[PDB]
Amino acid sequence: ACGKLTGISDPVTVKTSGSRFGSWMTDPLAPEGDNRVWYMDGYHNNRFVREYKSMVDFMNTDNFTSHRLPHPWSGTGQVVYNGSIYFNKFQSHIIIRFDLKTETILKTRSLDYAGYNNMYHYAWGGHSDIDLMVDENGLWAVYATNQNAGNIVISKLDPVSLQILQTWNTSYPKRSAGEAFIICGTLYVTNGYSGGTKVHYAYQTNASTYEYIDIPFQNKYSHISMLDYNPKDRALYAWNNGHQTLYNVTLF
Ligand SMILES: *[C@@H]1O[C@H](CO)[C@@H](O)[C@H](O)[C@H]1NC(C)=O
Ligand SMILES: *[C@@H]1O[C@H](CO)[C@@H](O)[C@H](O)[C@H]1NC(C)=O
Ligand SMILES: *[C@@H]1O[C@H](CO)[C@@H](O)[C@H](O)[C@H]1NC(C)=O
Ligand SMILES: *[C@@H]1O[C@H](CO)[C@@H](O)[C@H](O)[C@H]1NC(C)=O
Ligand SMILES: [Ca+2]
Ligand code: NA
């Protein structure tokens, strides 16, 4: 059921909470009936991940468990996959795989040549240099390098070893992307983080081709600091100026 993105539905406000900037997500490999929510407020100087027991508890309570990571993250580009959080260690291009339910670092590895420290942030800033994400095919990193002139680089990653399995060099400047997400092996890039937001560029990893496109999506609360696709519920999770929102998508 994989296909090209053709539409993004109007976003639902799941929660109003937190600072202007952050991330929230569910695990796409969590089993039926498990919709724990993982929540990270801020883009620097925070090592605590909130765990809400379910999407209902997230929407209707302020009850959560607080998980202490071994290091603070940078940015809002974390992802949860098969029970681990993958995140960018502060002030580095290191990725950490941390197994949430055993409080164990399972792997650390540098992401070769990636910029960090607000070098190749998305346009919103916030130390968003390295964005990790999951689609139907597995785990990916979206970043940039000096050898690719600050243009977005995509790598498919091994979720256990953190080694790069394949890399694609796009020609789109990462600092000009508001955010980005991958659906079915295609990178979709937004035009900005404020005002009238749209997906306006797509890079297809299956063919190493790109195009400019125009798929609007509602910036509901004025500023978007996190936007990722989840293949389990086929939705975009966003952090929109202190609100946690969710968009359905339409694929061809
Ligand atoms: C909050 O969650 C904890 C852990 O699941 C639980 O022990 C506690 O009863 C919850 N609080 C309420 C008011 O339900
Ligand atoms: C998820 O982790 C379990 C072990 O906890 C493993 O058996 C399974 O293969 C993993 N799934 C994927 C898709 O990697
Ligand atoms: C990406 O670009 C870098 C810098 O030019 C180059 O070293 C590398 O081989 C490229 N990788 C691919 C898969 O094109
Ligand atoms: C997505 O669509 C389904 C129905 O197909 C609906 O149950 C769900 O609430 C929708 N989610 C959002 C965020 O609109
Ligand atoms: Ca993203
Ligand atoms: Na991410």
Residue numbers in the entry: 226 to 477
Kindly provide excerpts from the paper associated with this entry.
Based on our previous structure, we designed truncations that are expected to result in a monomeric domain by truncating the dimerizing coiled coil and excluding Cys221 from the construct (the Olfm1Olf construct includes UNIPROT residues 226–478). We determined a high-resolution crystal structure of Endo-H-deglycosylated Olfm1Olf, which leaves a single acetylglucosamine (GlcNAc) attached to glycosylated asparagines. Metal ion assignment was based on previous binding data, coordination distances and fit to the electron density. The Ca2+ ion is coordinated by the negatively-charged carboxyl groups of the side chains of Asp356, Asp453 and Glu404, as well as by the backbone carbonyl groups of Ala405 and Leu452 and a single water molecule. The conserved residue Tyr347 stabilises the switch loop by forming a hydrogen bond between the Tyr347 hydroxyl group and the Asp356 carboxyl group (distance 2.7 Å) that plays a central role in coordinating both the bound sodium and calcium ions. The high-resolution crystal structure of Olfm1Olf reveals a hydrophilic tunnel filled with water molecules running from the surface of the Olf domain to the metal ion binding sites. In Olfm1, the tunnel starts at the solvent-exposed top face between propeller blade 2 and 3 and runs between these two blades towards the metal ion binding sites. Twelve ordered water molecules are well resolved in this tunnel due to the high resolution of our electron density map, including the two water molecules involved in coordinating the Na+ and Ca2+ ions.
Olfactomedin-1 (Olfm1; also known as Noelin or Pancortin) is a highly-expressed secreted brain and retina protein and its four isoforms have different roles in nervous system development and function. Structural studies showed that the long Olfm1 isoform BMZ forms a disulfide-linked tetramer with a V-shaped architecture. The tips of the Olfm1 “V” each consist of two C-terminal β-propeller domains that enclose a calcium binding site. The highly conserved monomeric Olf domain has a five-bladed β-propeller fold with a central metal ion binding site.
